[PDB]
Structures are given as structure tokens and as C-alpha cells.
Design an enzyme around this catalytic site. Structure first.
Site, PDB file in Angstrom:
ATOM      1  N   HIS C  54       0.755  -1.209   0.049  1.00 25.21           N
ATOM      2  CA  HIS C  54      -0.114  -0.056   0.035  1.00 25.21           C
ATOM      3  C   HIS C  54       0.750   1.157  -0.230  1.00 25.21           C
ATOM      4  O   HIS C  54       0.385   2.444  -0.576  1.00 25.21           O
ATOM      5  CB  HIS C  54      -0.783  -0.003   1.242  1.00 25.21           C
ATOM      6  N   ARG C  55       1.985   1.200   0.612  1.00 31.01           N
ATOM      7  CA  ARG C  55       3.064   2.135   0.304  1.00 31.01           C
ATOM      8  C   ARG C  55       2.846   3.358   1.309  1.00 31.01           C
ATOM      9  O   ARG C  55       3.524   4.500   1.666  1.00 31.01           O
ATOM     10  CB  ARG C  55       3.403   2.470  -0.939  1.00 31.01           C
ATOM     11  N   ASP C  56       1.629   3.593   1.735  1.00 37.64           N
ATOM     12  CA  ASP C  56       0.934   4.555   2.484  1.00 37.64           C
ATOM     13  C   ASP C  56      -0.597   4.432   3.059  1.00 37.64           C
ATOM     14  O   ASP C  56      -1.223   4.235   1.932  1.00 37.64           O
ATOM     15  CB  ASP C  56       1.224   6.119   2.076  1.00 37.64           C
ATOM     16  N   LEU C  57      -1.075   4.408   4.205  1.00 36.28           N
ATOM     17  CA  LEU C  57      -2.412   4.493   4.495  1.00 36.28           C
ATOM     18  C   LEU C  57      -2.932   5.457   5.599  1.00 36.28           C
ATOM     19  O   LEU C  57      -3.396   5.086   6.405  1.00 36.28           O
ATOM     20  CB  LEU C  57      -2.533   2.991   4.754  1.00 36.28           C
ATOM     21  N   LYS C  58      -2.630   6.687   5.109  1.00 33.59           N
ATOM     22  CA  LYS C  58      -3.118   7.794   5.904  1.00 33.59           C
ATOM     23  C   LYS C  58      -4.470   7.804   6.350  1.00 33.59           C
ATOM     24  O   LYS C  58      -5.236   6.904   5.609  1.00 33.59           O
ATOM     25  CB  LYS C  58      -2.993   8.991   4.746  1.00 33.59           C
TER      26      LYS C  58
END
Ligand code: ATP
Lengths: 590, 266, 186, 267, 75
Positions: C54-58
Site C-alpha cells: 500500500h506504501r501509505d495508508l493515511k
């Protein structure tokens, strides 16, 4: 028939008995017979035994393999267990056959464990094979005309041979009605020799139409997966286009000119269902019952190609600006619906949109033309969504932007809000509405300073308006988009606008527990130039709290709510106020 | 026989039947496409590395053959020759291993399967626009007269064939090929035929022919209201009259009786 | 004389989680928070099994849809939610599955507590300089009064020091389900 | 049953629409509000055991909100005698009502249509017949001035404290149905537009305004004030009946000019 | 080694007589058929011992799902 036709093209001597190539169907509802005479190649005793009397064995495969390497041969069938299906509705099966270099023989079976083959004397048959079926008791429906006609029409209609019937209508004569198939396939032939009118005649006999088409695409791919297509576009949208329910029968699928299956929930998406065509192919991994395709992924691949080609045609159809008005006035909703839910190809689908704009009277323009004629400092497009053409023409928000020579676009349709919610940027520019918490436009510093002074100039009535109206409007501020109206109302950034509320609240089948979270607060904007606000300042400064001030504030807010696209919850009070004023102005004391 | 082992591996990025109740698709399709492109480019980098290495190795082999040929006349180079031979043998064996890996990696692409742009390549394509002059309407009086005479005679023979029946689906197909052929003149002659049948006082035939006639002239009235020819509007009224509601049926019966009374007094 | 048939809608976007827990209060009960945590854990666990990062899940990526259904997305002051190994600038690939686990732990901590991490010092350069050469993590004292104890242990295990001792997603899912079917009130 | 009805109310109301053999036994489960219970859902079976002997039909209203219907001009007389009406505030009710027309061998008639009658004595009927001649010239005067925007403007008995209200025809979509069908997407509006929304007009001979207008109009036929008065009355009545104005700008400007006149700016 | 016999734990209820079941067992069966955190509202359990044989079991959820009025979701 194809076997004998190919074998003939070495020595005409094989056609010395019977030159015609035909297929006949003779119903007879007196001895329950459904004879199916033809004029094929024929069978011999030995070959009869090893083909008709051996489950899972086919002579077609052997004949195809034994024939050189590469020829004008495309036959149907490699499985072998296909003829015993005649026992689905049958009680007794007889086959009478003759080959060129043998005698006439008869084969009789009863779906048991034995068959009787014998030499017979009777009517000389030239070289064909008669297949006589003695039907059952409860299935005596297939001897009627309409059922046979429908079953032949649905499945086998593009066989290149003259299927006929010998029914008995009204001496009682002997009819030879040949209209079973008279529409020859047209996608097989070369594309450089078909002249328009043939395409129209083929289309008129494909799906029950009284008119002609508007476009045609005739592409074909090659390689491992190869097919041919004849995609069309109609003239007028059918009235029950979005009635669904009925199974879709617009795009078919053939393999060697035999119907297999029809559907358009996987072959094309849901917003391109107005296209008819044929997707004929050559070989595929079929099922044991030729009604389904194993490895369904293949179908999805086909979809890709079709979609791409279709989009290409649309762009080409934009080359002339005379038929595009006819196509865009009947199929406009599908493009926006596709724009709503499609992540791969949306930029290309965003260039076919046509809008009214505030520089052209009754001629639609495009977005690219709008980008062409912008100003030096202008950033972002200005849009507004409404309920009618002339309701949005003269409003309160536009009157300042249009006064400075800028441009605003109009969208008057329900789906336009859905389209706008997704598309957020075009060609590196933003879309900003003219009804959202004070949009900022380029300006001179002197006007900015004047606005800064005016902000403190009306600092007191602004706060005095707050406690008069309880929880309703969040806060009131001075705004600059009005020149000839006293007050207006706008929405907030994170929430529904007025038209979005109007469209949602009128939906039939949706819940009611999600209203409160997503509806946006509303802001009130007061114009510091209309003398009414000046008189309000004088009254508010002179008197802290008077009845007339309260009445004027409530009436002003109510009228502003009415004029900004919102819906009032208690119109009777407004009518009562109007009636009170009308009696105050025309005599009667009470 | 019947070997389908070749269509046993296909990959499609935007699959609409493979999702999770906690992933909103949209982004998943982008992820799958980007991953496939990245893997494709990685294998392409490896394959191009191997191919250009083989090409430069063939060039160096030709150069070494030239060096050996020039050493067939000269002398002195032995340690360099031994080093070159050993390095070339090791390079050849490792390149043979890499080539084995290559035709294994082709079957690996048969495992991590085909994509959209490998199965097929484009062929031929053409497109028309059909800029036909969609304006064809003859003079009113002349078309009325000619259609009346010829068309009304022939299709009045046909309507006399049809009128003795009362079936619906038979009437459905009859009006289907009629709206394929017939026009307002045939309907007007049907009206005058019903007038003369009223004159002839045939009660049961009156009832049946009047049923058919009121159906046809209600079609005509809908045509006039919509300003659309009855060639285009037959199927919807058919499918709403075969599945007509009870209130619709009683209204239709009231209209039938009113029209019968109107004609009887006419 | 040809009535009509009612036609259904298509869909509509729900409210983001960042807007729910930073702009409004929107306080729910413990069971609902555990259900949301289990749903996001399940979604990450499904995305876990096909080598997709996902590389980021803000938080604004997380969607609370109609009714209660968590949905994860990729659409896009954000120097807080990358792993302490992200700050490095070596080998240009410090990302693995433990980074996603760490960010899931951050989301879980915020979900349980309801306040932004590192609320004491507000200086982006100072924060990044301290984190890149330190071992300071948000204090675990700021928790709800009736919060469970196994959840605190899981949060402590979420980010200890290094990318080797983080737990894998199936263990987190199993522990979350075990606590979920054990919690009448405490 | 309350909890079950709160969540799954919409599926039942589709059965009366799409099914034709189970309407009789499914119409019992519907539960609405009523004009005698504050917060308590009654039923049609309980409703039929409360009407008077003289009553003969069921009266219903299709609105937008509970509070807006609670004080509408249509139910102002039928509630005075003591009769009972039932509230229907949702689009799905409109979709389902058009099929359900009978109950216990009784007909349903709305309070927002043409031709609504109350069985009563001939005294007031004779009085209204007598008053039907005094307001005859005004009928044709307003018919001419409205300029083919409405079809008929007659006198009838449906209001006691409102100078005007507007009703639709007997066969055609009502106001709320028109709003619902115009709002939705996928309209295919090339057909529906020029077919529906037939309207009439309603007045009462009790308010001072109508009597003043009559006494003014008997003297002068071509005065300028009558045009303004009739236009404003039509606009306000059209507003307070569920319809939507064609252009709010003109009405807003009229209101602003009226306030400016009332607070002395002139010019 | 591990012994995970949890491949199946839920027994088929609909083969038992209707009157020998409590409400708790019905709720537990409803729990592990659709992932939910609530019990049911009403249960019906009948059979047709005619020429054709079939027995059914039908429930009623307490709270409606959000996506039950969509276009082409896999019902
Ligand atoms: N009318 C006919 N004339 C000549 N040969 C026939 C005829 N009908 C069937 N045959 C023979 O029957 C054999 C194949 O029979 P069958 O239809 O069972 O197999 P198939 O061709 O593989 O199946 P199908 O083509 O129906 O899918 C072949 O040897 C073919 O020549």
C-alpha cells in the site's frame, strides 16, 4: 454438403447424379414424422458402422487430418457424441443412405443396445441421407409451423445453404416457402467492395428496424485469438433502453457461424448497451454442450479491444459538426454515466462533452475551445448547476463574474452533478463553483483595500444578525459576487450543494439515517451596496431590538433561501406574511 | 487429443469479479497494472542485458578468431591466450546456463501468463459515417391519392383476409408487417370498411372488426399525439395490451362501447 | 397509461475517518471501534497476500461507508506516519511489510485514543531531526478509561525498534478476533 | 413490529406495485400516522372502525414533510367537521398508492385532486349555488388575464382561511409525483415533458381580499391594479402548494420592491 | 505439528425436529453463517413432505445492509 462440394472441385464426374445443393424439412402431423432430407456425400456399410455405431468417434476429424496441409475447409465438429441428442425427443430413428459407389441402405435404432442395418428397396435417393424421426406422445409441439420457424431462426440462420419447408397451406397445393434464411453473412467478405446500402439492408434484417444506421466499424484482429466484428450505432434510442429485466440480445457471439451465447454484461460495459454487432470467431475452448465458454477470462480480453475501437469511432465522428448534434442529442447520458465509473479511459472520454456557455447563444461549445479563449491571469473554470435554462441565466452569483468579462458554464441536468463530483481537473486547470464560501478571483490592490475598510465598516450589524437567527446559518460575512441584489446564501466545501440535496431527497429507494452526517452548513452573504442594508444599519444603530427589525431580518433570510435553490419547510408562514402585508397596503384594518 | 492446455493461463488487470469487501477497486486496478508493468520491464531489462551481452560476445568471439588467425603466423602470446581461453570457457558455460534460464523463463511467462497485448495484434479496420440526406417526404395530396389507390387496394385485400380473425399474436405479427408496409391511408380505408360493415348489420363480425379497428385507431391517436408514425410505435402498445391491467381493461371496454354507440349513430 | 417502475441508485462516497476524528467528535462505543479495527485489519490482510504494498495508508484514505463498512484507498503535514526507517536515504528501498504494520498500529492507537500523536512539540524540522536520530514514541498513558489490556500489549508490540521483530498481519487478525469475541464490557 | 417496520418498510410497498395476487393480504401490514395520534402508528383496519356512519371513503394526502402537511391549506375544512385524514410522506407511498385503489369495497380519494365532495345538507349547498352567480364575471376576467396558464378557475368548498389554492386534474400526475419524476436521473425526457401536469384553480368567497377585488373589478374592467393583484396571488398560491417557480428572480425582486416601498426609498 | 480440526464445527440444525431447539442455538447458527455481531429477529422452520421433498430455514436480519438496492451485485 461442404464435403461433397470440396470433393467436386477436382473432377466434375462426381456430380453426374444431382447438381443442386439443398436442405429440406418435411413436417407431417399424421404419422408424426419430421423428415430432414438433404443431398450430402453419403455413407457406406463399413463407414456407417464405424461412425454411427461407435460412441465418441467422428469421421470429420479423420477427413480433415487426411487432407494435405491447408485448404479452403472449415467444418464444424470434433467431439463425436452429437447425433444421439436426437433421442431427447424421439422414439424411433431411421436413416436411409446412399453413396455414389454403393447401394441404398437403411439403419434403424431404438436407443437400446442394438441397431439393425439392412439393404432396402424403395424411393431412389440420389446421393443424400434421409433422417426420419418418430416423435413421442407428449412432445408433439415440434410439428407446428411457428415453433420450427423460431427454433431455426434463433440457432441456425447463417448457414450458407437453402433451408426450405414443404408445409400445407391454402386443392391444397404444395408450398416451397424458402424465406428461412435469405440474409447472407457479410462480415466474411472483403471490406473494400461493400457499398453502404448492403450494410443498411443487413442491419434492417438484423434487429427489426424501419430505418438505417449511422456508423459502422468492421475491424478484425489476428494472432492466437482472432475474430471479426461489425459494430453499429443506431439513429434513435429505443424507449425501453434502460428498462433492463429482459435478457440483453444486442451483441451476439458465433464460432464458425453457429450461435453459442449472447450477453453484454461482460462483453461490453453497462453504459455502451446501444450497440449491435457480431463477434464471429474461429476456434475457442468450448464446453461439451456448445452453450458456454471455459476460461471466461477470454471474454474479458475481447471486451478491451471492442471498447478501444468504439472510442476511436467516436472521435472520428467529431470530425464533422453536423451529425454530432444528432448523436449527442440522443445518447448524452451514457457518456457521463461512463465518466462517473471508469478509471482507465476517462481523459479521452472527457473531450467529447459539449456544454452551453455564456458567450454563445444556442451553439454548444467544448472545453478545449474554452481553454483557448481564456484571459492572461485567469485560473480555473467557473461552473454552475441549476434546474432550467433561464432560471440559471439571471442569478445572484454570476452577476459579478460576468460583469468583468470572464466566462461561466451552465449545467442544467441531474446527472451533471454526478459527472462533476468525479472529474476534478481538466488539462492542468481546476473546476471551481461560483456558490462555495467566497471563491477568489484576481483583483487590484485598491479594491482589496476598499474591501478591507468595508469589512470593518459593517462590523456591528454582522454580529447583530447572529442572535436573531438561532442554529441555522453558521455565520454571516461580507461577500463580493453581487452587484444588484441584497443578500444570498452559499454552501460549504465539505458537503452537498443545493442541487445535490434536491436530487438526493427525491430518491425513491434509499435510507434516511445518513442525512445528518453529510449535509453541509449554510452561510449568508450580505451586500454592502443596496440601500436596504443601509437602512438596516441605521435602524440597528438607532435601536437595539425592535419588532420591525426582526420581521425584516426573517423576511430577508426567507426570500434569500427561496431564491438560492433551497426548499422551504413551512410555506404557510411565508404566505401569511405576504397576506398581512397585502392587507396592510390595501385598506382593510384587519 | 483435444488439448486445451495452452489456454490455461491468462492475466487480466481490471477484473470485476475479484474484489474484497474492504477494498474499493479503482485503486486496486491501478496497483495491478503498475505491478504488471514493473515486472514486464524487469524481465525486459534482464532479457535485453542477455541479448546485448550475447551480441557483444559474438563480436568478441569474431575478434578472438581474428586474433587466433593472426597468431597462426606470429608467436609469443601464451599466457594471454590461456587467460582468454579460460575466461571464454567460463563465460560460455555461464551464458549457456543463462540461456537455459531463458527458455525456462519463457515457460515462466506461460505460468505468469499472457496479457492483453501479447495474444493478438491489429489487422485491418474501416469506418463509414453515412451522411445520408434524411429528408424524404413526398407531396401530401399526390402520395395520398397513389397510396389510396394501389396500396389501399392490395392491403384491403389483405385486411379482408385478416379481419375475419380475432387472434392477438396473429394480429401482432400482422400489424408488425403492416407498420413495415402500411400507412394512414390503409387505416382510413379500414375506417370506411367498418362504416360499411355497420351499414351491413353483422353483429358478431361488427364486434370483432370493431375490436381490431379501435385498437388500430387508438394506435393512430397515439401516433397523432406523439407526432410519430405508426411504423415506429406498435410494440409498446402491444406489450401493454397483452398484459393490460383490470382498470385499463375496463377503460378500454368503456371506450369500445362509446365508439360502438358513436358509429351506430353515425 | 404506461405507469413506471422504481429505479435504484448507484452509490455515494462516505465520510473520511480523518474528518470524523479531527474535525468532529463522533464518539462511538467500544464494540464499534473494535469492529472497525477488525475490518481494516482484514482488508490489509487480504492486500497482504499478493505482494502488493500500500506504501501509505493515511487516515483520510480510510473510508467509513454507508452504515458501517471500512474501505481502504490509495487516493492522494504528513511527516508523522512513515516508519523510522523511512527517514533513511540509503538503497532507495527501505520499505517492507513491517512499515505497513507500523502504520496500522499508528491508526489503531489514534482510533483508541482520539488525539494526534506527538502533541507536545510542533516543529516539523525538529520532529524529523529528533525521530531520525532518536527512539521517542508516543506515550502509552493516554488511553481510554475502559480500554482493554491485551490491546495495549499489541500496541506496544506494534513498533518496538526495528523491522525484524514486528508481528505479521495474520497474528494481529487472530488476536483482534480473540479479543472481539471476549468483550461484554471489559 | 416497530423495530421491524422501521428498517424494512420499503420492501412491502413494492409488493403492492409489482405483485397482483397478494395485494389483499399484504395491504393489512401498512402502518401510517394519523390526525388523532401524536406519535403512534395506526392502521387502515383500525381506521375503518372509527369513521362516522355518513362517511363513505378514505381521505389521504401526499406531502413532503410531516410539519408541512400538518398545517396545509387543503386539509382545513375536512378536519373542521371532525373527519380523519392519513399522512403519507415518502416517494414510495406515491409509487404504491396509484395501484392500491380499493379497501373493504371502499374507494380512496385524495384531498389534492378535482371533484371532492362532502355529503351534507342541502342548505349550505343551496347557499353555495346562490353564491355561484355573484362571482361569475370574475371567473372569465381571471381566465382571460391568466392567459392560458390554467384551464379552469371555478368556485368550490375546500378552504376556510386561505384566499387561494391550486389543484390538479383528475387524470394526470399530482404535484409531488411531478417533482419526483422531474428530479430523478435517466429520465429520457424527450417524451414525458409534453404530456402531463394539468392544473386548475380554486378560490373561496369568504376572505376580505376576494370580496374587495370583486367590488373593485365590477367598477373598472381594464385597471392596472387588478393585473398586479392577480399575478401576485397566483404566484403565492402556486408557491404554497408544492410546486416550483419558473424564475425566482422576478418574485424576489417584487418582494424587495415591496419592502423598499414600505420603508421609504422611492425612485 | 498442529491439529486444527476447525475446518468444520457448525453442525446442520435444519435436520432436527422443530420443537427441540432453543433460541440460543438458533442465534449461534446465525452467527457463523453471516459475519454479524447481533442475533436474529424471527425464525421459520418447516418442510414439505409431499411428492417433492424439501425443507427450508429462513431468518430476518435485525438491521438492513447498506447495499441491498444496487444494480448487479452478486446476490
Ligand atoms: N446427413 C449425413 N450425411 C452423411 N454423413 C452424416 C450425416 N449425418 C451424420 N453423418 C456422419 O456422422 C459422423 C459424425 O456423427 P456425429 O454428429 O455424431 O459426430 P460429429 O460430426 O463429431 O458431431 P456434430 O457435428 O453434430 O457436432 C460423420 O462420419 C458424418 O459423416
Amino acid at each position: 454438403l461442404d464435403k461433397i462440394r470440396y470433393e467436386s472441385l477436382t473432377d466434375p464426374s462426381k456430380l453426374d447424379s444431382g447438381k443442386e445443393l439443398k436442405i429440406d424439412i418435411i413436417p407431417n402431423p399424421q404419422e408424426r414424422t419430421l423428415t430432414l432430407v438433404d443431398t450430402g456425400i453419403g455413407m457406406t456399410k463399413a463407414d456407417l458402422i464405424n461412425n454411427l455405431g461407435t460412441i465418441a468417434k467422428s469421421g470429420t476429424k479423420a477427413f480433415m487430418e487426411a487432407l494435405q496441409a491447408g485448404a479452403d475447409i472449415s467444418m464444424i465438429g470434433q467431439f463425436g457424441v452429437g447425433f444421439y441428442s436426437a433421442y431427447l425427443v424421439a422414439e424411433k430413428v431411421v436413416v436411409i443412405t446412399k453413396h455414389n459407389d454403393d447401394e441404398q441402405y437403411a439403419w434403424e435404432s431404438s436407443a437400446g443396445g442394438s441397431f439393425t442395418v439392412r439393404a432396402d428397396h424403395g424411393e431412389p435417393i440420389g446421393r443424400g441421407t434421409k433422417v426420419i424421426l418418430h416423435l413421442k406422445e407428449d412432445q408433439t409441439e415440434y410439428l407446428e409451423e411457428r415453433r420450427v420457424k423460431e427454433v431455426v431462426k434463433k440457432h441456425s440462420q447463417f448457414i450458407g445453404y437453402p433451408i426450405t419447408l414443404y408445409l400445407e397451406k391454402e386443392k391444397e397445393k404444395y408450398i416451397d416457402q424458402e424465406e428461412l434464411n435469405k440474409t447472407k453473412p457479410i462480415w466474411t467478405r472483403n471490406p473494400d467492395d461493400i457499398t453502404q446500402e448492403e450494410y443498411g439492408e443487413f442491419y434492417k434484417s438484423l434487429t427489426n428496424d424501419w430505418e438505417d444506421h449511422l456508423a459502422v466499424k468492421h475491424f478484425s484482429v489476428e494472432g492466437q485469438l482472432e475474430f471479426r466484428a461489425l459494430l453499429f450505432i443506431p439513429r434513435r434510442a429505443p424507449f425501453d433502453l434502460f428498462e433492463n429485466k429482459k435478457k440483453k440480445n444486442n451483441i451476439k457471439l458465433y464460432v464458425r457461424r453457429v450461435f453459442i451465447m449472447d450477453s453484454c454484461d461482460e462483453l461490453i460495459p453497462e453504459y455502451l448497451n446501444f450497440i449491435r454487432g457480431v463477434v464471429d470467431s474461429e476456434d475457442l475452448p468450448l464446453n461439451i454442450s456448445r452453450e458456454m465458454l471455459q476460461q471466461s477470462k477470454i471474454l474479458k480480453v475481447i471486451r478491451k479491444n471492442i471498447v478501444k475501437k468504439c472510442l476511436e469511432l467516436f472521435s472520428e465522428l467529431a470530425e464533422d459538426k453536423e451529425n454530432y448534434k444528432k448523436f449527442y442529442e440522443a445518447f448524452s447520458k451514457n457518456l457521463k454515466l461512463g465518466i462517473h465509473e471508469d478509471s482507465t479511459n476517462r481523459r479521452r472520454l472527457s473531450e467529447l462533452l459539449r456544454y452551453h456557455t455564456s458567450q454563445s447563444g444556442d451553439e454548444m461549445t467544448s472545453l478545449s475551445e474554452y481553454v483557448s479563449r481564456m484571459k492572461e491571469t485567469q485560473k480555473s473554470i467557473y461552473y454552475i448547476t441549476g434546474e432550467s435554462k433561464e432560471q440559471v441565466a439571471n442569478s445572484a452569483f454570476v452577476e459579478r463574474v460576468r460583469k468583468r468579462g470572464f466566462e461561466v458554464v451552465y449545467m442544467t441536468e441531474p446527472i451533471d452533478e454526478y459527472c462533476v463530483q468525479q472529474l476534478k481537473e481538466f488539462d492542468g486547470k481546476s473546476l471551481v463553483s461560483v456558490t462555495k464560501e467566497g471563491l477568489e478571483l484576481p483583483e487590484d490592490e485598491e479594491e482589496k483595500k476598499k474591501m478591507e475598510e468595508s469589512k470593518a465598516k459593517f462590523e456591528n450589524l454582522c454580529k447583530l444578525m447572529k442572535e436573531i437567527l438561532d442554529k441555522k446559518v453558521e455565520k454571516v460575512t461580507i461577500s463580493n459576487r453581487l452587484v444588484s441584489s441584497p443578500c444570498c446564501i452559499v454552501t460549504s466545501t465539505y458537503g452537498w450543494t443545493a442541487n445535490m440535496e434536491r436530487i438526493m431527497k427525491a430518491q425513491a429507494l434509499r435510507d434516511n439515517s445518513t442525512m445528518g452526517y453529510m449535509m453541509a452548513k449554510k452561510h449568508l452573504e450580505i451586500n454592502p451596496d443596496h440601500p436596504i442594508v443601509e437602512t438596516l444599519r441605521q435602524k440597528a444603530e438607532a435601536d437595539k431590538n425592535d419588532k420591525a427589525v426582526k420581521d425584516l431580518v426573517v423576511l430577508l433570510f426567507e426570500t434569500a433561501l427561496l431564491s438560492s435553490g433551497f426548499s422551504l419547510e413551512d410555506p404557510q408562514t411565508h404566505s401569511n406574511r405576504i397576506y398581512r402585508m397585502i392587507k396592510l397596503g390595501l385598506g382593510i384594518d384587519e | 487429443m483435444v488439448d486445451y492446455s495452452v489456454w490455461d493461463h491468462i492475466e487480466v488487470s481490471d477484473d470485476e469479479d475479484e474484489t474484497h469487501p474492504n477494498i474499493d477497486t479503482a485503486s486496486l486496478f491501478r496497483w495491478r497494472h503498475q505491478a504488471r508493468v514493473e515486472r514486464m520491464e524487469q524481465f525486459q531489462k534482464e532479457k535485453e542485458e542477455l541479448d546485448r551481452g550475447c551480441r557483444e560476445c559474438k563480436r568478441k568471439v569474431a575478434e578472438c578468431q581474428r586474433k587466433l588467425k593472426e597468431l597462426e603466423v606470429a608467436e609469443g602470446g601464451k599466457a594471454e591466450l590461456e587467460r582468454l581461453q579460460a575466461e571464454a570457457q567460463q563465460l560460455r558455460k555461464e551464458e549457456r546456463s543463462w540461456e537455459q534460464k531463458l527458455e525456462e523463463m519463457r515457460k515462466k511467462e506461460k505460468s505468469m501468463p499472457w496479457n492483453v497485448d501479447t495474444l493478438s495484434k491489429d489487422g485491418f479496420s474501416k469506418s463509414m459515417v453515412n451522411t445520408k440526406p434524411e429528408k424524404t417526404e413526398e407531396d401530401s395530396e399526390e402520395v395520398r391519392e397513389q397510396k389510396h389507390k394501389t396500396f389501399v387496394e392490395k392491403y384491403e385485400k389483405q385486411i379482408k383476409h385478416f379481419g375475419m380473425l380475432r387472434r392477438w399474436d396473429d394480429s401482432q405479427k400482422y400489424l408488425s408487417d403492416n407498420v413495415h408496409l402500411v400507412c394512414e391511408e390503409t387505416a382510413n380505408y379500414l375506417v370506411i370498411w367498418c362504416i360499411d360493415l355497420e351499414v351491413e348489420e353483422k353483429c358478431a363480425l361488427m364486434e370483432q372488426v370493431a375490436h381490431q379497428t379501435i385498437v388500430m385507431q387508438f394506435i393512430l391517436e397515439l401516433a397523432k399525439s406523439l407526432k410519430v408514425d405508426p411504423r415506429a410505435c406498435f410494440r409498446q402498445f402491444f406489450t401493454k395490451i397483452k398484459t393490460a391491467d383490470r382498470q385499463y381493461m375496463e377503460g378500454f371496454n368503456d371506450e369500445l362501447e362509446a365508439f360502438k354507440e358513436r358509429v351506430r349513430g353515425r | 397509461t404506461k405507469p413506471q417502475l422504481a429505479i435504484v441508485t448507484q452509490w455515494c462516497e462516505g465520510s473520511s475517518l480523518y474528518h470524523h476524528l479531527h474535525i468532529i467528535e463522533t464518539k462511538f462505543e467500544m464494540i464499534k471501534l473494535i469492529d472497525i479495527a477488525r475490518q481494516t485489519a482484514q482488508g490489509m490482510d487480504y492486500l497482504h497476500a499478493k505482494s502488493i504494498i500500500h506504501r501509505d495508508l493515511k487516515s483520510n484514505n480510510i473510508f467509513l461507508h454507508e452504515d458501517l463498512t471500512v474501505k481502504i484507498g490509495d487516493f492522494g503535514g504528513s511527516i508523522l506516519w512513515m516508519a523510522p526507517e523511512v527517514i533513511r536515504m540509503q538503497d532507495k528501498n527501505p520499505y517492507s511489510f513491517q512499515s505497513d504494520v507500523y502504520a496500522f498500529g499508528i491508526v489503531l492507537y489514534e482510533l483508541m485514543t482520539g488525539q494526534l500523536p506527538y502533541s507536545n512539540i510542533n516543529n516539523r524540522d525538529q520532529i524529523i531531526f529528533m525521530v531520525g536520530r532518536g527512539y521517542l514514541s508516543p506515550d502509552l498513558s493516554k488511553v481510554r478509561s475502559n480500554c482493554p489490556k491485551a490491546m495495549k500489549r499489541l500496541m506496544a508490540e506494534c513498533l518496538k525498534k526495528k523491522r525484524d521483530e514486528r508481528p505479521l498481519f495474520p497474528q494481529i487478525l487472530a488476536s483482534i478476533e480473540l479479543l472481539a469475541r471476549s468483550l461484554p464490557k471489559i
